[PDB]
Design a protein around this ligand. Sequence first.
Ligand SMILES: CCCCCCCC(=O)N[C@@H](CCO)C(=O)O
Ligand SMILES: CCCCCCCC(=O)N[C@@H](CCO)C(=O)O
Ligand SMILES: [Co+2]
Ligand SMILES: [Co+2]
Ligand SMILES: [Fe+3]
Ligand SMILES: [Fe+3]
Lengths: 276, 276
Amino acid sequence: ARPKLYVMDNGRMRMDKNWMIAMHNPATIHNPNAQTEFVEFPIYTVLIDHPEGKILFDTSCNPNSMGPQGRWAESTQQMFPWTATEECYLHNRLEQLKVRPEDIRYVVASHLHLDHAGCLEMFTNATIIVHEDEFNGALQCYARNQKEGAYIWADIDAWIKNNLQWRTVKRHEDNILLAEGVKVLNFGSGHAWGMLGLHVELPETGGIILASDAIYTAESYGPPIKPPGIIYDSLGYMNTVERIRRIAQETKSQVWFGHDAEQFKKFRKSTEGYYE
Amino acid sequence: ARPKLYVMDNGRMRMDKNWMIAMHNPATIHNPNAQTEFVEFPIYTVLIDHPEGKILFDTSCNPNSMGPQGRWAESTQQMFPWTATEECYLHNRLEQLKVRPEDIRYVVASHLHLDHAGCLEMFTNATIIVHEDEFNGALQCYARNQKEGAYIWADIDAWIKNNLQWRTVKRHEDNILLAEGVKVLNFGSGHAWGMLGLHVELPETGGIILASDAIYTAESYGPPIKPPGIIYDSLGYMNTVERIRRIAQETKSQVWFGHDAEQFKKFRKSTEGYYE
Ligand SMILES: CCCCCCCC(=O)N[C@@H](CCO)C(=O)O
Ligand SMILES: CCCCCCCC(=O)N[C@@H](CCO)C(=O)O
Ligand SMILES: [Co+2]
Ligand SMILES: [Co+2]
Ligand SMILES: [Fe+3]
Ligand SMILES: [Fe+3]
């Protein structure tokens, strides 16, 4: 198999750096009212154009997220603002590659946060691969009518109305061979209820791990590890980063972080080419 | 048994409120450089004068913690400054009750942080009850020569030189009857590697849960729960708070928080009296 892997730029988000790096600048007797900063980072998605069928990793934010008529609650829009030109929307990035939503055989949802699961509703011809614990947690947010936080009610509403086809990865489930040189990694609980990664083996480029929010940035990754400011499972988070470090060492793979502005700058994006 | 329980005031600490309440005031598009606060809170200890023998819960900070010749690293003194008059030192609070260090039969160390294990070295005639996972973690900090952070090298150094007598609570160990109406609760990992609480049943006052840093304040406790800015085991922390809530409900017990300024103000301290 001679796949082509594309990095698609789906715009920029800002938030409190304390979300990204917990207690990054603690108050002191000399700086008792210490200030945070509002840091900018990329949202992106990965397309694997594979002869056995097209695989998409993450789906970015819904085009209807922001604004007075937006799906995102006003508090969410103010703490986690997303900025994107029309060329950044996932449907346009895919159209520029001559890829219609119906051509996607698999969507791997790293997790179901607003900045990863925003366009799942497009992929009505795919199998949506998601962690069972992540799916359960998001569906409880929906059933409880939660309007704030990182699980977007109107996104989930659209997944159910559009009759998406789900394959849940079970809590103790091995790492799933999707296609030649493409493996779903079950990271389990950490950043969210259930995290999935991807291990891709390309003939030219060699190994790539897509970590998504298992590892926000190179600063998260250290060593030593700098965890995020809120976390579902701190122990699982720390175990997941060290497991990724060991897999990268043993397989000589690059690690692609979820939201690293400096790493993302260096990628070849879908407007310039691809990785074989 | 007709015990007397004393609350001893061991002075005041300040730190970034984000340590106390994770992401208490997140940056927004309108407040992108949001300021934290440097909040003040009590350090205290509990003496149970029991006919079966005196039980101490926690030991506050070492009198030699602060200052240019202090045991605390300079970064620790600046992020977690302790202020205490000599009357606040545990040795003096106990002397004012005519209690010598040698009169303590049991010391329950909730955990081994700087603000709880600072005077263990005084209690050479006691059995020191500690969670096995907390002891292991602190002893690794000692062995790796760590000088910064919440585990004070020079305090651990004095515990070993003074030949303290340890009883470790094992990870799966039940809740230990120390004396009539005094039970050690094994909370397990959460805030730190291994947390112990106390459930005291007094004839007049009824039930008291000493939670220590399993629950910092009433704001932590909610509901809903507001976790602290850094945590060893987030899942264990959240389970521990709900377990304490259920025990309080099923036994009609008061919950005494680790560091709640408003609750502490309402306690009768060792200069005014005691609880029977
Ligand atoms: C009201 C509290 C909001 C919930 C905090 C978690 C939201 C979050 O972490 N959102 C994004 C930030 C970008 O990574 C994510 O983690 O994927
Ligand atoms: C160098 C970073 C310090 C480690 C952060 C945890 C220290 C901590 O939480 N210390 C005290 C704060 C007062 O409760 C404690 O939890 O007992
Ligand atoms: Co996320
Ligand atoms: Co503590
Ligand atoms: Fe994210
Ligand atoms: Fe404390």
